[PDB]
A = this chain, B = another copy of it.
């Protein structure tokens, strides 16, 4: 019993974290096989950040310009190149702790674990969602760039996020591991801002199923709804429209609990319109949207 925001164990990722220094700037990199990946902004002076020509800035850098440390062991850089917003530093040693891995680009609404790191040293782990506006509501301080986000599936690590910057509202932006940003953001000094965000409807419905599995049932009613009529209430309360794909994804949780997807939608509609009337759901007074259907099933497991 119980339901917690839960992160993947971080060890397989800790074994890949290194410190990358270029001049006075230090941040983190990810060492997989004989390559270290890190944000390309590591090569920039403060002045360069205002209008960087990264191609031209990189050409003036030498392999010797980069100091890479794995723990207390220096790794010699033998090649450097750029891939989108990442630097790929080829090194003289293949990481013996490289896990089975994949690079994946995740979709808005999906969740992942973040291993916050400073100076190549892991400091904490937490679970996030990629928001509809392509930011994450993380916890990052200066020095955290190059920290990564990931999921783990049967000992295979799917890396999905590398941290590049904080935005003025204090939320966070980065790239996939091919170096393409999530969202319209750019790695240079501009007035860019996160767009308006939305609540992740599918995740809220998942979390209601989790509540039911854990014994909180008070919000279930005898009301019914159609997809159209639900989406009218979603729109008013700044929720994403529910789609048929979303309904299908909720099939397994619906079958386990015996509550029809549209019946849970009727429960959510009443929660939106009326509040909780002094009650809690899994100890929350807010409707949580950072658990996916997969997270619920994984954590509540079998029987």
- Contacts from A to B (Cβ < 8 Å): 1-12, 14-15, 115-116, 122-126, 128, 137-141, 166, 170-172, 214-215, 280, 283-286, 299, 301
Contacts and interface: CB of A to CB of B under 8 A. Distances in A.
A213 to B, nearest CB: 11
Nearest to A299: B139
9 contacts: A2-B138, A2-B170, A4-B128, A4-B138, A5-B126, A7-B124, A10-B10, A10-B11, A11-B122
B6 A126 contact: yes
A139 B285 contact: no
Given A2-B170, A3-B139, A138-B2, A9 B126 contact: no
A132 to B, nearest CB: 16
A297 to B, nearest CB: 13
Given A284-B286, A286-B284, A299 B6 contact: no
A37 to B, nearest CB: 19
Contacts of A122: 9, 11
Closest 9 CB pairs of A and B: A11-B11, A1-B170, A2-B139, A6-B124, A4-B139, A9-B122, A11-B14, A285-B285, A4-B126
A159 to B, nearest CB: 16
Given A11-B11, A141-B301, A285-B285, A6 B125 contact: yes
A9 B113 CA distance: 11
B2 A125 contact: no
B6 A9 contact: no
A291 to B, nearest CB: 12
A9 B123 contact: yes
A216 to B, nearest CB: 11
B9 A140 contact: no
A128 B283 CA distance: 14
A274 to B, nearest CB: 15
Nearest to A167: B1
A11 B2 contact: no
